[PDB]
């Protein structure tokens, strides 16, 4: 039985982290998790904090920063955000925005048009325009007008709810999950698919210097259908927090499914 991430750390070269649930839950940071990542950095690990976050790294990390997580505590960070610029480029460039004023950092530096609902030949959602009080109901009539009109939908946050200090939050994916539903087509990057992955494995390699096996990284998270599920179908060993609120495997309807959760480890928080 594991009673830290000490007594795993001697088998992997490299670790794929989760942020929201493990490292700081949006309002305050974890002390146990952050001395337990430094504890690997110090013998020779690389740490990758791997986020559904639809916003690019940089905002990530200065939030990280806020509250309270150093900079020796990972090597880099690899954002849902980060890889959904790639849909986002490959896709039409008059773009319907769903999501709020700050989410717009996903656009910096790419060749699109953000444009009125009837004038958008693409839909990227990055979450609810106001996450406070908003629902999905409330984009019912929204979605589909959109799903009429055959727009493709790219979701830059797969989760369905995350926490925000003692509050849980609508995300994009509750919003991808209803377009799907609706029979639209929806494009999506972030955790449990591929291309987030793929991204922190070249950052790894870039940073070791060579190639690093699947055997020797090991993935940490709270969501099943995230963090779990993506690691697996990467080919990762995972260490599964079981103690989190698992904010990922919410459903629209805003129920946890109690028997969701095979990883090789399980603690309680990361410590
Ligand atoms: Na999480």
């Given at each position: 039985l594991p009673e830290r991430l000490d007594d795993l750390?001697?088998?992997?070269?490299?670790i794929f982290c989760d942020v929201w649930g493990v490292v700081h839950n949006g309002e305050t940071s974890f002390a146990p998790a952050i001395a337990a990542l430094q504890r690997a950095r110090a013998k020779g690990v690389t740490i990758i904090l791997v986020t559904n976050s639809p916003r690019p790294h940089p905002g990530v990390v200065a939030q990280m920063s806020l509250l309270?997580?150093?900079?020796?505590?990972?090597?880099r960070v690899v954002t849902s955000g980060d890889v959904t610029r790639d849909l986002i480029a490959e896709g039409p460039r008059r773009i319907f925005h769903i999501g709020c004023?700050?989410?717009?950092?996903?656009?910096?530096?790419?060749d699109v048009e953000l444009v009125e609902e009837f004038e958008a030949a693409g839909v990227v959602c990055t979450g609810l325009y106001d996450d406070e009080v908003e629902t999905p109901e409330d984009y019912r009539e929204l979605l589909q007008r959109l799903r009429s009109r055959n727009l493709p939908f790219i979701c830059a946050?797969?989760?369905?709810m995350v926490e925000r200090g003692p509050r849980l939050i609508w995300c994009a994916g509750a919003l991808a999950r209803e377009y799907g539903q609706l029979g639209g087509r929806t494009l999506i990057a972030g955790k449990p698919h591929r291309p987030i992955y793929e991204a922190a494995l070249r950052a790894v390699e870039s940073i070791r210097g060579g190639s690093v096996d699947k055997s020797r990284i090991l993935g940490i998270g709270?969501?099943?259908?995230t963090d779990v599920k993506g690691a697996a179908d990467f080919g990762l060993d995972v260490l599964y927090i079981?103690?989190?609120?698992?904010?990922?495997?919410?459903?629209?309807?805003?129920?946890?499914?109690?028997?969701?959760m095979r990883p090789i480890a399980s603690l309680h928080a990361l410590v």
């Amino acid at each position: 039985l594991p009673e830290r991430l000490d007594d795993l750390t001697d088998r992997y070269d490299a670790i794929f982290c989760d942020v929201w649930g493990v490292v700081h839950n949006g309002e305050t940071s974890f002390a146990p998790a952050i001395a337990a990542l430094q504890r690997a950095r110090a013998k020779g690990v690389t740490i990758i904090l791997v986020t559904n976050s639809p916003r690019p790294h940089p905002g990530v990390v200065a939030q990280m920063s806020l509250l309270g997580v150093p900079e020796n505590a990972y090597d880099r960070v690899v954002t849902s955000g980060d890889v959904t610029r790639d849909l986002i480029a490959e896709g039409p460039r008059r773009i319907f925005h769903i999501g709020c004023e700050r989410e717009l950092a996903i656009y910096d530096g790419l060749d699109v048009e953000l444009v009125e609902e009837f004038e958008a030949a693409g839909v990227v959602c990055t979450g609810l325009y106001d996450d406070e009080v908003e629902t999905p109901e409330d984009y019912r009539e929204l979605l589909q007008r959109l799903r009429s009109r055959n727009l493709p939908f790219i979701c830059a946050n797969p989760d369905i709810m995350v926490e925000r200090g003692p509050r849980l939050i609508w995300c994009a994916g509750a919003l991808a999950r209803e377009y799907g539903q609706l029979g639209g087509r929806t494009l999506i990057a972030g955790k449990p698919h591929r291309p987030i992955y793929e991204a922190a494995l070249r950052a790894v390699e870039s940073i070791r210097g060579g190639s690093v096996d699947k055997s020797r990284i090991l993935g940490i998270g709270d969501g099943v259908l995230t963090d779990v599920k993506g690691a697996a179908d990467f080919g990762l060993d995972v260490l599964y927090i079981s103690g989190g609120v698992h904010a990922a495997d919410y459903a629209v309807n805003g129920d946890l499914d109690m028997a969701k959760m095979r990883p090789i480890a399980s603690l309680h928080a990361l410590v």
